[PDB]
Each structure stands twice: as structure tokens, then as C-alpha cells.
């Protein structure tokens, strides 16, 4: 089982040698536990002020961003292509109810369409009248779901939980703490 016990000689900690090692193994609660002291020749050596890699470091970059010949900055200028905040008041939701949408229109052409947009944008129809005139097809498709149920609060990344039991759990069976993955 990965993450299980590893012996004390694969841990970078000083420990004991000679007869004292055998004494320690005889007298230790768990013989594979390290002492906490880092190994002086190995740990934090060479010192940070004398690393050889300092004299070779170069600033890191990633293609195609570092290219000298094909990247115009405005093609990768993400700050200024930021999504606008979309504000919808009751007049706009009305307009959506009656005249349909850009994706699926329910509007006539010519002056009729523009005048319909106008008199909704003036207040000719209220939201409640909008809902009342609204047919079954439009209510079910465009307010509720196609089955007539309301939409559930959306989630960006749905998380499916699984419970780990047995040897792979953190705690054994008795403890009041379970492992969710």
C-alpha cells in the first residue's frame, strides 16, 4: 500500500551506528522512525549562495509567447478581451419572452420588428403580462426545462464523491473520521 512504512535507512536523518544501533532497534517503539536531525553533508549543501546553477540561469519562457516573428501582442492580450458584465432588467427579460431570442427568433421583419422592440423598451408590455401571454412551448423551453421542471443551481465542475474504506482509509474502522475521495 503506497504511503506505508519505509525503513529508517531510506530517510535523510542522522540515526545511530554500531552497537548503539542494535540497542536502538531493541528499545524503539517503532524501529523505523527517524530522529529528526538532517544529515549535515547532504542537507542544504551547497549553500544557496554558492550554487553552480546561478552562473547558468537564464530567464524562462514558453513558446509561442517568446517567438520573435509571429506573435502580435493584441492576439494574446487577454486583459482587454475581458467579458463584459451582462445586466438584464425586467424590460430585457420581457423582450426575450415576447420577441424570442437572437438564437431562435419570434419576431417579424421590417418596421414591425423595430416597433415591437420599441414598445417593449417603452413599457407597453409588463413582465407579468409577458408571462401570462407566454405559451406552453415557450414557458417549458425557455423558462423551465423541456420536461417542465425548474433548473437546478448550476455548478461549474460537478464533483462526484467516493468513500474509501478498508486498508486504504486514513484511520481504522473505530475512529469517527472517514476518507472521502
Amino acid at each position: 500500500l503506497p504511503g506505508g512504512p519505509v525503513p529508517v535507512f531510506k530517510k535523510y536523518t542522522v540515526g545511530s551506528k554500531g552497537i548503539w544501533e542494535k540497542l536502538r532497534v531493541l528499545l524503539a517503539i517503532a524501529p523505523n522512525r527517524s530522529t529528526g536531525n538532517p544529515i549535515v553533508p547532504l542537507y542544504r549543501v551547497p549553500t544557496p549562495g554558492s550554487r553552480p546553477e546561478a552562473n547558468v540561469y537564464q530567464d524562462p519562457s514558453s513558446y509561442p509567447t517568446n517567438d520573435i516573428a509571429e506573435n502580435p501582442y493584441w492576439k494574446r492580450d487577454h486583459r482587454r478581451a475581458y467579458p463584459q458584465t451582462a445586466f438584464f432588467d425586467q424590460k430585457t427579460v420581457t423582450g426575450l419572452l415576447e420577441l424570442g431570442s437572437e438564437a431562435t427568433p419570434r419576431i417579424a421583419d421590417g418596421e414591425a420588428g423595430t416597433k415591437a422592440l420599441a414598445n417593449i423598451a417603452n413599457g407597453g408590455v409588463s413582465f407579468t403580462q409577458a408571462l401570462g401571454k407566454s405559451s406552453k412551448d415557450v414557458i417549458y423551453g425557455e423558462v423551465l426545462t423541456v420536461n417542465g421542471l425548474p433548473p437546478v443551481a448550476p455548478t461549474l465542475a460537478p464533483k462526484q464523491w467516493k468513500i474509501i474504506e478498508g486498508e486504504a482509509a486514513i484511520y481504522p474502522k473505530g475512529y469517527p473520521c472517514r476518507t472521502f475521495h
Binding site: 478581451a81 451582462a86 432588467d89
Partner: protein
Amino acid sequence: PSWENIKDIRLDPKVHVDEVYEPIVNPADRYLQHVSDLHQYAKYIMAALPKYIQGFSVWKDELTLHVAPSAVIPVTTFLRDNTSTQYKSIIDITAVDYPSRENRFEVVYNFLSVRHNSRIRLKTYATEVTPVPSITCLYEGANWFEREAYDMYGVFFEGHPDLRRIMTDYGFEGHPLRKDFPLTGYTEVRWDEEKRRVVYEPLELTQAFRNFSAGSTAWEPVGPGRDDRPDSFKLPTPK
């Protein structure tokens, strides 16, 4: 089999790449389908409470409902309690001082629905003399947040059982997060030897506050952006 012969990691062969490839992607693109879903959801909510919801806004993954102060109790109850919403956790409550509006403060509520893994934001407005209905009757956690909103801004919360300063000194005059309250306050304290007690005195700084905001840019920095509205939420054009 012992620590004196433990293998030196420092001399192991490290991985080496020659060129790193990171494609150029706009981070807002990942939210498109979810923005459509939030739009549909907000449409449903407005249709369900046309008496209360004055409008919504959607930005990436954050949905906001704008309501009048009288609409707060009904809308909060509907959010907390409807099966499709279930916004059981109050996250925070705050105010934002807009001195240009007739109603200065706008009160913001964030809710969290552990059932559905979804969040929502609800806004209202208030003034220095008109209060907002307290939602402590619905969410217990809102007690302290409303005491903080009052302390910082002065917004009153009608029906709050125990509304008093939570942060500022005892006997502090002024609501510090108001845009007209100066940075350094009006008073300071020191120990007074004659009186043997900490006394309050008009502010006097040894070095004056240097406001470097005078060097703000003289050129508009970002521009208009782009709209991520789904085609199912834009009014149709005739022909």
C-alpha cells in the same frame, strides 16, 4: 542498509527540457457553457418572483440578483428554502459606498449551497437613514456580519437583536469605510502625565500622508472588452 550509505539525491540526473510549449488561451472561454446555465437559472428565478427581482447580472461564474430593500426577506427565504436553490450557508454581508447614487450604500449578500455546489449574490440598497431588514431570523451567521456592516458604514439593519460596534474603539465617532472619512481619522491617543490616563486629541501627524494617486494614467487603460452573452439571451434583430 544504513544512513551512512544513503544515496546522494543531489547527483541524480535531473529532467531537462529544451523548449516549453504553453498555448495561448483566453481564460474566460472555460466559463461559456456555465454562463449560459447561469443565465437560464436567473431567468427562471426572475419569472418565479416578478414582484421582487429587479434584475440580475452574470460574470463568468457569479450571478447577482438586484432587489429593493423591502424584497430582501422574501427573496432570501426563497433562496434558502426552495428545493432547486437551497442556499443554506451565509458567506458574508457587506456594504459598498457609492456617493454618486441617491442611495449611497449597496448591501451585498453572498450565499453558498453545499447541496448543489453553487453560489449566489444578492444586492440591495440603503441610505444613511433608511434601514435594511435584518436576515438574522433566517441565517444565524448574519448577526456579526451585520454588526460589521453597521460599524464600518452606518447601515442600519431593522430587526437585528443586538446591533452595536464590533470593530472600532468604544465611543468612536464616524464610520471609517465611508468615502468621505479621511484615511487617518480625526483623533489620536497618547498617555497624559498630568491626568495619568490615555487622552484623545486632534490628529497631528509628524509626516503628512502623501497621496500618490495624483499620478493616475491619463489614457484609458483597458477599453470595452467583449460580451460573453449567449445567443439565447440577446434580443433578435428584425430580418
